[PDB]
Amino acid sequence: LTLRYFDAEMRYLREAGKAFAQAHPDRAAMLDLDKAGTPDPCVERLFEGFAFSMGRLRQKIDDDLPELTESLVSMLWPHYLRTIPSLSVVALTPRLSVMKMAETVPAGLEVTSRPVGPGNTVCRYRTTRAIPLNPLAVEKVVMTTEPDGRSVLKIGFACSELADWSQVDLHRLSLYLAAEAPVSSTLHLMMTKRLAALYLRLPGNDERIRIDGWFSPGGFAEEDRLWPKGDSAFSGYQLLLEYFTFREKFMFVHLNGLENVSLPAGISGFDLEVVLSQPWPADLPVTDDALCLHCVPVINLFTLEADPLIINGLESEYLLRPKRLQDGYTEIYSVDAVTGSGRTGSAEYVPFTSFRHRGGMLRHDAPERYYHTRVKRGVTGMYDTWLILGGQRWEADRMPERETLSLRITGTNGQLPRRALQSTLLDRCEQVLQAPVSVRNLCKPTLPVYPPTEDRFHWRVMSHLGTGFLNMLSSAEVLRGTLALYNWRDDELNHRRLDAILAVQHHRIQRFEKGFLLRGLDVEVTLDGNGFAGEGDIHLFGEMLNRFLALYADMNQFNQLTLIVQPEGKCIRWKENHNPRLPG
């Protein structure tokens, strides 16, 4: 504060007093500052308190804007001055008597919530992630241990018109399950290793559909831990949890079997499904932690409304705290879109980074449109609160308090205690929904991730990667140029997983089906060193499904993943059927 106020005084008095007097002797032949003596009045003591005092605040402005501008121009290719909300997996189950054409309707839903803290409740964002068909039911699945290491599921229910209903959309029901990672992902290591699966028919209630001509595999992962770095190699127009989350864009092992069931008479399904090549290992507990339906970990998003306020001069800074924010809401989110009714144009609003250039160069039929915000802080007890500013040649000269203005805005919650609860109340989701549903909060609410990077010196690496090269060379690049997006949770497990030994570049030539050469590469990484994680059979399988999908690096490159754990029994290859239409 006040000592470095004094520093600029003693700096410049020494600077203008001595380094300006003798260190420029050419025009110190036109000014002799030492020998001439002080003037008679108190005229030197005022102006050193005046001309040096303005030197203070001007430099203190200069030590403010590079703390903002470097934050702003470095938000261009990465998009990580943002924050991440909280999320936890929700399971849903319709009732059984309303199975009569039980088509799932994901048009408009709600969420369930739970009061917490100072009477505060939850507003999670509803789901429009589609379900093709409801399940029949989950029958009491017991992992039936067999001499080949098998462990089977059973499902089935029928009280309805299932012959016509399941005829509609059972064909690509890529429907899944989840459990704890030493047990759930153990099947994922064997979902890629499924054998013939000879007795493949669900029991109990296929007496009424009587056609097994269609098949449906499945696959799932806990989509919060490894997946954000897979959710980071993308463009400049995608939402961090609204683009990826309800989108099935991931690569899941939907290995589908085609061997027909052998079964006695009067049987609607035998109970073997799970023929393996490996014995199901010892000391692994069994449970019925395998849902027939559970939706995503879905996030807090408010749908907030505000009233338009228009001033010629509001375009500079106005910073409104809207009405529902006043009653204990702690946070909002980024502004969505502005419309309304002006004088000439009804609604003329384009965001900042997509301007179709009348103020630029395109210059045709796409007028002056600014719409831009900041996140600037100075809040009495927070890390951010700001509302928009944007201005160009509109008609504020004839309309000082009139403009097309109607905002939309979303929100989250920031100020909270550290608890995790079950979403219980607001069961009014089921009111379109003529078949009633179940409410199951399946897991614990995570924290909202809001420690992004703090100091100014990690961000040099964030500007290094342009003039630097791709993290596919020697693994000092892959060590360093790995994001701290895994370190934003600071998993000590995943930090041990950042122990990779130097990658080797190779390339190769492949013949195609129709007799053509297709260029490729070969990445060869080495673990060398032990204690990656608990089960490397579990983890390094679940690792390479991540690190391969973030390896799309040109247009005519056949893919390349050969994982080499230390010479301790195995080396894992990864390649797919890549074709002249789309990579597999």
Partner: protein, 350 residues
């Protein structure tokens, strides 16, 4: 200028009690932007500027509220508000100067004109940091390929000097700059390049395609007596090279944009956006389109008959409704040659 108060303070004297100084100086340069009184020209030529009557008030930022502008004295700023605005003022006037103003009296009213010569030339540049010289966020600059926050913030793609041979200057920084920072990438950026330029149009890419000719100049399937080779070169008379000639389709449903992709309209937009910005001499790109039937006439004169290579949209005098068809081709985005010649000299004997 005389037009600077004649536009602003004679017409807009209705929000001056609650105006920002940040807003006020911006509208001055927006009042006559055509050949403006540039604020950077303060360093020698503040004479004959006629700037706004801010100085002598001693005010901080966003606290200029008083509104009096003269017209007879040929320079509008003559302002000194007494007892208010002592911004950084500590001690009173010196001994010999009071003996010339005589005596910190009514003569001081004609003394702050010379006395505030220092505060005039500083609150120009005091404002200029907050709005133009270190802030602008490439938004308050708002240039047209002049403002330096663009050129500082665009040379990280490697385009200084390379505006040559382009019919437009560098305008598509607003979306392509995150995509144009990853090296050697990609195919999925070509989807963004189309959805930017004309909405309603979608894009699909096939990575390999059956390209043809390049005709090899020795036929090489002479079966040789002295010396021949086998290992790789086995063929007939024309070769096939897949390796680098991707196929791109577009799909529109608004007929005003159908007449934009035929050559003359938006085809000049893609054809310069590819060749020097995103791809260059990496690859060659094939274009294709699928619409409903066409809107295409016939054999009229000099230049606009051809719908690329094909012709249609003229013969169905039979049935009411739709049939879907592929449209046409467009040319490759290629640049090549041989130059002519044979050589005369050599490298070095090391």
């Amino acid at each position: 200028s005389q037009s600077a108060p004649a536009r602003l303070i004679t017409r807009y004297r209705k929000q001056l009690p609650y105006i920002n100084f940040y807003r006020f100086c911006q509208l001055l340069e927006q009042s006559q932007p055509d050949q403006p009184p540039i604020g950077s020209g303060w360093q020698a030529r503040q004479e004959a500027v006629r700037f706004c009557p801010y100085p002598g008030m001693g005010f901080p930022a966003s606290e200029i509220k008083d509104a009096v502008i003269p017209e007879e004295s040929h320079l509008p700023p003559i302002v000194h508000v007494t007892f208010m605005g002592l911004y950084g003022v500590t001690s009173p006037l010196p001994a010999h100067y009071i003996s010339d103003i005589a005596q910190q009296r009514e003569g001081h009213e004609a003394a702050a004109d010379f006395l505030d010569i220092f505060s005039h030339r500083l609150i120009t540049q005091y404002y200029r940091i907050w709005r133009k010289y270190s802030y602008p966020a490439t938004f308050e600059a708002g240039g047209q390929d002049k403002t330096s926050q663009y050129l500082l913030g665009l040379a990280r793609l490697g385009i200084p000097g390379c505006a040559q041979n382009i019919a437009t200057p560098v305008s598509r920084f607003l979306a392509l700059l995150p995509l144009m920072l990853l090296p050697g990438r990609t195919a999925e950026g070509l989807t963004s390049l189309v959805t930017l330029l004309a909405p309603g149009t979608q894009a699909r890419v096939w990575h390999h395609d059956r390209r043809r000719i390049p005709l090899k100049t020795p036929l090489t399937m002479r079966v040789h007596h002295p010396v021949s080779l086998k290992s790789r070169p086995v063929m007939g008379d024309h070769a096939t090279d897949v390796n680098g000639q991707v196929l791109l389709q577009l799909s529109t449903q608004t007929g005003s944009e159908v007449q934009g992709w035929l050559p003359g309209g938006h085809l000049y937009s893609d054809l310069l956006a590819l060749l020097h910005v995103y791809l260059g001499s990496r690859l060659d790109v094939r274009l294709q389109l699928c619409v409903e039937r066409s809107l295409l006439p016939d054999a009229r004169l000099s230049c606009r008959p051809a719908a690329g290579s094909p012709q249609l949209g003229r013969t169905a005098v039979m049935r009411t409704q739709a049939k879907i068809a592929t449209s046409a081709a467009r040319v490759m985005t290629i640049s090549l040659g041989r130059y002519q010649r044979v050589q005369e000299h050599y490298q070095r004997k090391e």
